[PDB]
Amino acid sequence: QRIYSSIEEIIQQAQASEIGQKKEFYVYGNLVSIQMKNKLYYYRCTCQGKSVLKYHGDSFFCESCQQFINPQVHLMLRAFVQDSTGTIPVMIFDQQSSQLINQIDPSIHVQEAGQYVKNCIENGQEEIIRQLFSKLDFARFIFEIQFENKEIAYKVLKIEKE
Numbered sequence: 001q002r003i004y005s006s007i008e009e010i011i012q013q014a015q016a017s018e019i020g021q022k023k024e025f026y027v028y029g030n031l032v033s034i035q036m037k038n039k040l041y042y043y044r045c046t047c048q049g050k051s052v053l054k055y056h057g058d059s060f061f062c063e064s065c066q067q068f069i070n071p072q073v074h075l076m077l078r079a080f081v082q083d084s085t086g087t088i089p090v091m092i093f094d095q096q097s098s099q100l101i102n103q104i105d106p107s108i109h110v111q112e113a114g115q116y117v118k119n120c121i122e123n124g125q126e127e128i129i130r131q132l133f134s135k136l137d138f139a140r141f142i143f144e145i146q147f148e149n150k151e152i153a154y155k156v157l158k159i160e161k162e
């Protein structure tokens, strides 16, 4: 059976941990404030590399597989997760970001969520995306969350709306 943990507890286990350490928890609560200040989307390679340089003339070079490639556009979101007991900043990556977008606008397939966001933002439709992110404000989910010493960074591994 699944055992949930309060944000309060997670934070204190985090404070009391060594550098390389990582732990996963199941959390219940809501999403607050998807952040629109930073770059929402990034170019990624099929080699699981985020390290992708954009060259002139529609070229992209992957630092990992060390070659020019044709990248995908992936969502990387930063938000706050909040239960009755606490609040934390988390990073949500493409599988889960895309899943959220798709869940508010099911016309947008997970596969294309990043591109959708990029095309809107870069062509004067940022508002349309702000709107989108707002409808998630205070929506409740069950998350699987992971922390790690580096600061303590928290990442969403999994999301389910219930």
Ligand SMILES: [Zn+2]
Residues within 6 Å of the ligand: 045, 046, 047, 048, 049, 062, 063, 064, 065, 066, 069
């Ligand atoms: Zn690569």
